[PDB]
C-alpha cells in the first residue's frame, strides 16, 4: 500500500494555523502537516478520513500526500498552499483584485465541487474558511473530514458534526437532513463571500434569526463587485427546494462564458 510516510523525512518548520505546521519533506517538498493529538479524534475516524481524502484527488482539491501514524502526534501531510486561507486573503488583499480574478476563484471551487458531485459526495461546510489560495490565486477546497456520501436527488440524515448555520441549506436546519444539493446552497454563500471580499454573511443577525428569515424568503443582497449575471448564478443556488437548485456541472457551464 501507499499512505504511510517516513516521519524522519519530514522537518517541521513553523506553525501555520491552529495545529497545522509548515514542513520540508525529503529536503525538496514544501508540506503542510496537521497534528492529531491522542483523543482529538478516534483512530478509526482518522483512517477513514485519510483514505477518503486520498481517493478524492483532483487539481482543485487539497492534495493529500500521506500520514505518519506510528506514534503521536499523528501527522496528516498535504501539499503546502502558499497564500493560505481564502477568507484571510479576501480580507487582506481582495480590494486590489480584478472582478475576473474573483470569478476565477468561484470557478476553481465549482470545478473541485463538480468532481465531488461526480462521485456522489457533498461538502458539508463549503465556505471561504475551508478554501486555500495558491501562488497564482488558484483556489483549492479542503474536503478533510467534511464530505458525506449522498445519492443524486436523495436525502440523508445530518447526524454528525454541526457546521455553521449561515452556510447551511434549509433542509439541514428544518429537516435535519442533507440533500445532494445542500452543497450548492453553500456555494452561493461562498460566491457572496468572494464578491463581498470576505464580509460575514447576514452580519447583523443571529443563527436563530437567519434560520427564520431564510424560511421567510430572505436572501443575501448583491455585493457591488458582482455583475447582475453573477448574482443571478449565486441566487439560483438559494432555491428552498433542492430539486430547483442547479448541479455543480450546470453551474460550471453557467460560469464558463463569463470567462471561466
Q: Which is nearer to ligand 1N1, 62 or 230 (CB)?
A: 62
Work out whether 80 is an interface residue with ligand 1N1 (CB under 6 A): yes
Binding flag, residue 84, ligand 1N1 (CB under 6 A):
yes
116 is a contact residue toward ligand 1N1 (CB under 6 A): no
Stretch 9-28 residues interacting with ligand 1N1 (CB under 6 A)? 16-17, 20
Asked whether residue 16 is marked as a ligand-binding residue, the answer is: yes
Q: Which of 61, 62, 172, 233 binds ligand 1N1 (CB under 6 A)?
A: 62
Q: 132 vs 169, which CB is nearer to ligand 1N1? A: 132
For residues 218-249, b (16+ Cβ closer than 10 Å) or e, as one string? Answer: eebebbebbeeebbebbebbbbeebeebbbbe
What is the distance between the alpha carbons of residues 145 and 142, in angstroms, rounded to a whole number?
9
Nearest position to ligand 1N1, beta carbon? 84
- Asked if residue 34 belongs to a known ligand binding site, the reply is yes
Q: What angle do CA 164, 43, 176 make, to 5 degrees?
A: 30
Among 52, 83, 247, 254, contact with ligand 1N1 (rule: CB under 6 A): 83
54 vs 258, beta carbon nearer ligand 1N1: 54
φ, ψ (nearest 5 deg) of residue 158: -80, -5
Note if 203 is an active site residue.
no
Residue labelled with grid coordinates 475516524: 45
What does the binding site for ligand 1N1 look like in residue numbers (CB under 6 A)?
Answer: 16-17, 20, 32-34, 62, 76, 78, 80-81, 83-85, 132, 142, 144
- Residues with active-site annotation: 125
Residues of each annotated binding site for ATP: 16-20, 34
Amino acid at each position: 500500500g501507499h499512505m504511510e510516510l517516513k516521519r524522519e523525512e519530514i522537518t517541521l518548520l513553523k506553525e501555520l494555523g491552529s495545529v497545522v505546521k509548515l514542513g520540508k519533506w525529503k529536503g525538496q517538498y514544501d508540506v503542510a502537516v496537521k497534528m492529531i493529538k491522542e483523543g482529538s479524534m478516534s483512530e478509526d475516524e482518522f483512517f477513514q478520513e485519510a483514505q477518503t481524502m486520498m481517493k478524492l484527488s483532483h487539481p482543485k482539491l487539497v492534495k493529500f500526500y500521506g500520514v505518519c501514524s506510528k506514534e503521536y502526534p499523528i501527522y496528516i501531510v498535504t501539499e503546502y498552499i502558499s497564500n493560505g486561507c481564502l477568507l484571510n486573503y479576501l480580507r487582506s488583499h481582495g480590494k486590489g483584485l480584478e472582478p475576473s480574478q474573483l470569478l476565477e476563484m468561484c470557478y476553481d471551487v465549482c470545478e473541485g465541487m463538480a468532481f465531488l458531485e461526480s462521485h456522489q459526495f457533498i461538502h458539508r461546510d463549503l465556505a471561504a474558511r475551508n478554501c486555500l489560495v495558491d501562488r497564482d490565486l488558484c483556489v483549492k477546497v479542503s474536503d478533510f473530514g467534511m464530505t458525506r456520501y449522498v445519492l443524486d436527488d436523495q436525502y440523508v440524515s445530518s447526524v454528525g458534526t454541526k457546521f455553521p448555520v449561515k452556510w447551511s441549506a434549509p433542509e439541514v436546519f428544518h429537516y435535519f437532513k442533507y440533500s445532494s444539493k445542500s452543497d450548492v446552497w453553500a456555494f452561493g454563500i461562498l460566491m457572496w463571500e468572494v464578491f463581498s471580499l470576505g464580509k460575514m454573511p447576514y452580519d447583523l443577525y443571529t443563527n436563530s434569526e437567519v434560520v427564520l428569515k431564510v424560511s421567510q424568503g430572505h436572501r443575501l443582497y448583491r455585493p457591488h463587485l458582482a455583475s447582475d449575471t453573477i448574482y443571478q448564478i449565486m441566487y439560483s443556488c438559494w432555491h428552498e427546494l433542492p430539486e430547483k437548485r442547479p448541479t455543480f456541472q450546470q453551474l460550471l457551464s453557467s460560469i464558463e462564458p463569463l470567462r471561466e
